Write a protein that binds this DNA or RNA. Structure first.
Lengths: 342, 149, 200, 345, 150
DNA sequence: CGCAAGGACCGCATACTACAA
RNA sequence: AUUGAAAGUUGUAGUAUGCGGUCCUUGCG
């Protein structure tokens, strides 16, 4: 199925730490990666969980603009389920089940996991842009041809859903290959000397094929609105660098933030037993995308307001657009705040 | 898991060898245990080359040229010097040859001096050497804390 | 680049006295007064530390272990080592009451005020800033000798402060100790040649 | 998510600050926390949370916390809430095993009961806002950068989203600066008497002619921190503000911080202990810092009637921490790391 | 085929420091003075500026500060131990800031074969700041190796 | 007329699969 | 001319909660 697709773009306002599994190796709590390549990633389970929680919390306040009507959980449930609805309302009061809209879209709760599946699917969020310190200029966005390759693959997958031939052609228009150390750099990052763009601890050579970079910016303008998540897109167009695969992988491993944290005793004035530990944080301004898919709503006796893939897609688009999300652990210490552009 | 067993055996062997020298002297045993514990922190902050340079610097001698071999830890005067020479010797030995030709891990440096190897190589060699040093240090921390006084 | 410099304030340029110098001179003066009066008891109680310090001094000076004299300086070094890492045994001598100014302060009070490696101190030593009224008319800097350097002239006012972070009232004793130290020893380089003395 | 109200905390340093970041082998032995990619200084939210919780617990223990114009006694109030188990809680609290009732409710449970429930505050990072830089004509300018303004706009958008009030977005919507690499939108006071030039540190550069920007900035400060920038009249700040490009701004935060050469002189020789020589790095005084705190509904079961709504919690924190003096970073006793805090909305 | 500047920094620092030990093995005073100068330079750089420190080095070498040619300063010319150490330190710093590790190496300096003093004289602030950063890093590494071996 | 951090503490405690088929 | 032909280990589910890189120390003879 999955007759409709919405691309979600995330911008990290603050450093984000999505907790990995067992805390092994030298670093205590590392970010989630993939052994297959080594790049950072966010598994779809956490994304679906946070989206479901936000959706349910919004629905409980009757702030969800269901076709600009502010659908009421109790009223809609009574209209749909009729006689038994009241009983379900009690289950909603006990925080056992969930209101009608979120149950229909994201699937039911644990105790009722035998009626219908979830009408949505949330893919893993993959990196697309990585901040990196630079000598001239500051804070250069970086990316690699493999990322663009995966992006083209995702576009092709979308085309198998909505027949977006123009998007496929636009993606196929871009084809670059930096060999070992040369980079495609914007005008700002270029050192005042002859080429020689210096990223972190590496000195590179610029390559004069910047049109491709421009095309990439166009793709962004095609995908995530006009302003680049609240900034002038052309402003970011001056600070984009494309580098080889191995260099990008090296950046995605030895440039995440590393932080040491301690606990202070009540009155001793110094650390205590089991107080010192380490954490790894994904840098701010990291751009990561995903792929949300929607198929046929499998819920029984769905409401007339939301009874087609187009309706669900519109609801998701309006509810999540320039909104804000809390992602991962370390919430109370200001970590995980992101801006979502659909 | 063969590499894991190799690392565990090597860590136990070096910690036992440290136990043999100045077994009663809790000064050398205590200093070495803290030195192994605090070592991985430096590597994360400053990289492998900087940590190796610091280890070379803390030794109190002319230290002409650079040699992972030689530099007998017992020849060092102060107990801290002996412990630091021991730590450097163990780490450099593991990175150079591991446990031997027939071992599962023959060492990434092909028997070469780790500092010279870092000085004349590519980036990826430095990366893998860094990761391997981090892993062996992680094992050595536990094994030295467990039994050494 | 100039052979000499002063700790001039970054934002304004007026010279000032850091609180670290206050704490350091106070601890040094307390050590001196403790060693001068009860020297024999301190030297006798911690015999092992005295022997270790003698050995270290002999090794550093390339002299014999017995050649080290048990002067007041050796006592000061031993006391300094006592307030260092080997501070657990100091509770053995935690009964002498040094007569600082006109009040008796116990060594336990010294540990509770100054702070130790395993416990933060309870007395904060703020910085010292000359009052602007004096700077309004009287000059605040002067030359001093063909090698010249800038120094604060005599008579310049300076205000100091001391706080008590915890409920311990050691603030008054700390203030008395600081006042006595400033009166007798003073703070500043070349303190041998009268520099840094403070009157009332 | 669960937040409904927010407060913008402003920090004004009066003494050099030093938030520790471990120890390195570089020239500076004790550097400060910085974001990796940008390289600008920063104070993480964890240190702020720890300091705030410590101060709150200290004030509650001395029964000096005044909620709704009444002291929140640790033993008395918790007696009503915990009911039968209050005796166990009181004894445990006295044994320094768990934090008092109010701290537990606000800043979340203590280490022993970490799995009980969650907190209600989300104190965030402290991004730089105004860097004090020495100037040739005039004194001690407040340099800032367009990146800082953009980040500030983002935080204001987040605040307006939490509060559902577009006034903040409207206020910040006018911010749009495009300063070049050698031009500053300087205030009148800092302008050198000459060809409309400013000498900041080692950089001399022409002054772009623009208006209706600096004033806007000052207006923002008047929206949250009352009318006095940490006590001083806002007019001097308005006349003493400069804005420069990202490159020079970064160049300033790398070579315009306090550097000290602290030592430890041994008693025996009287000169210096072996290895007693190192350099410490400090943020300058009069640095303007800002951070965001978000407040959600309390999660502890059977909470006291005084603290049930996020509004009450916000009022409590605003009353407690407004115009107070706090300690941040190391060397507390030495005399470094004292700041003045201001709240707002 | 890619080496970070860290590899070249250590390679360069090892080259010069080892080049002193074999040259002036008997002159322990020269080695000590060189080590002290390498320890003390970064604070001067951080306090005054790269141009200030370079001019100071020239002043201790009784040479005019307006026209310089690092490629024309033989360290063996100076007679005093302090003078010889200062000449060596200045030559090493200027050579690194001009050619880096080498033209073949990944890093080839910053001034592109220009006297660093003149480069600071006739460039904008950003170039000076980046050159200052590079000088700080190499001075750190040279101090490390000099303390370790000298 | 030179001197050149050094040790403490180095993830704790809790959760540790449920219901259908 | 075979215990044979037929049957998606599938549905739900945020590695999350608590935690101050802190203490000790005169840039000096």
């Amino acid at each position: 199925m999955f007759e409709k697709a919405v691309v979600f773009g995330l911008y990290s306002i603050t450093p984000v730490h999505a907790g990995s599994g067992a805390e092994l190796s030298v670093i205590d709590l590392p970010i989630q990666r993939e052994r297959h390549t080594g790049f950072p990633v966010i598994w779809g389970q956490s994304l679906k969980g946070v989206l479901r929680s936000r959706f349910r919390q919004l629905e409980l306040d009757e702030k969800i603009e269901v076709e600009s009507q502010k659908w009421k959980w109790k009223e809609k449930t009574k209209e749909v389920l009729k006689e038994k609805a009241d009983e379900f309302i009690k289950k909603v009061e006990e925080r056992k089940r969930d209101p009608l809209l979120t149950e229909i879209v994201f699937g039911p709760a644990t105790d009722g996991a035998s009626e219908h599946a979830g009408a949505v699917s949330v893919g893993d969020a993959k990196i697309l842009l990585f901040p990196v310190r630079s000598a001239k200029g500051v804070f250069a966005f970086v990316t690699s041809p493999i990322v663009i390759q995966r992006l083209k693959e995702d576009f092709e997958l979308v085309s198998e859903i909505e027949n977006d031939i123009e998007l496929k052609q636009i993606l196929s228009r871009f084809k670059v290959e930096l060999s070992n150390n040369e980079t495609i750099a914007g005008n700002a990052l270029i050192l005042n000397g002859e080429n020689k763009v210096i990223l972190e601890d590496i000195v590179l050579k610029v390559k004069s094929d910047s049109n491709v970079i421009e095309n990439l910016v166009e793709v962004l303008k095609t995908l995530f609105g006009d302003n680049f998540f609240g900034k002038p897109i052309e402003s970011i167009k001056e600070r984009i660098a494309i580098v080889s695969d191995d260099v990008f992988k090296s950046f995605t491993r030895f440039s995440t933030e590393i932080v040491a944290r301690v606990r202070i005793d009540a009155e001793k004035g110094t650390v205590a037993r089991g107080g010192l530990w380490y954490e790894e944080f994904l840098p701010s301004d990291t751009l990561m995308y995903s792929l949300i898919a929607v198929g046929s709503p499998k819920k029984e006796n769905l409401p007339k307001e939301v009874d087609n893939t187009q309706k669900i897609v519109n609801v998701l688009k309006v509810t999540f657009n320039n909104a804000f999300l809390q992602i991962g652990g370390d919430e109370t210490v200001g970590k995980g705040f992101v801006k979502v552009r659909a | 898991r063969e590499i894991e067993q190799e690392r565990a055996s090597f860590a136990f062997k070096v910690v036992s060898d440290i136990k043999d020298k100045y077994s009663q002297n809790k000064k050398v045993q205590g200093k070495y245990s803290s030195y192994a514990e605090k070592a991985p922190t430096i590597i994360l902050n400053n990289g492998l080359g900087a940590t190796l340079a610091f280890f070379l610097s803390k030794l109190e001698k002319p230290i002409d040229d650079v040699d992972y071999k030689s530099i007998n830890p017992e020849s060092f005067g102060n107990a801290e010097n002996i412990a630091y020479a021991f730590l450097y010797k163990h780490l450099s030995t593991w990175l150079a040859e591991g446990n031997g030709k027939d071992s599962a891990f023959s060492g990434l440096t092909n028997g070469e001096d780790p500092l010279k190897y870092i000085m004349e190589k590519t980036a990826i060699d430095v990366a893998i050497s860094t990761e391997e040093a981090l892993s062996i240090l992680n094992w050595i921390k536990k094994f030295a804390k467990a039994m050494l006084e | 680049v100039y052979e000499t410099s002063i700790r001039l304030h970054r934002n304004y340029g007026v010279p000032y006295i850091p609180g670290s110098a206050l704490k350091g001179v106070a601890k040094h003066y307390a050590f001196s007064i403790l060693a001068r009066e009860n020297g024999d008891e301190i030297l006798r109680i911690y015999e092992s530390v005295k022997e270790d310090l003698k050995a270290r001094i002999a090794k550093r000076d390339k002299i014999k272990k017995n050649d080290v004299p048990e002067d007041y300086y050796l006592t000061a070094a031993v006391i300094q080592e006592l307030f260092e890492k080997k501070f657990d045994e100091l509770g053995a001598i935690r009964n002498t009451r040094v007569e600082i100014g006109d009040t008796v302060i116990s060594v336990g009070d010294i540990v509770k005020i100054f702070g130790t490696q395993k416990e933060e101190g309870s007395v904060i030593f703020f910085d010292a800033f000359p009052t602007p009224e004096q700077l309004k008319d009287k000059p605040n800097l002067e030359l001093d000798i063909p090698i010249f350097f800038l120094t604060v002239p005599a008579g310049v006012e300076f205000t100091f402060a001391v706080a008590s972070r915890d409920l311990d009232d050691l603030a008054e004793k700390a203030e008395k100790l600081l006042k006595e130290a400033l009166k007798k020893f003073g703070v500043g380089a070349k303190t041998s040649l009268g520099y840094g003395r403070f009157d009332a």
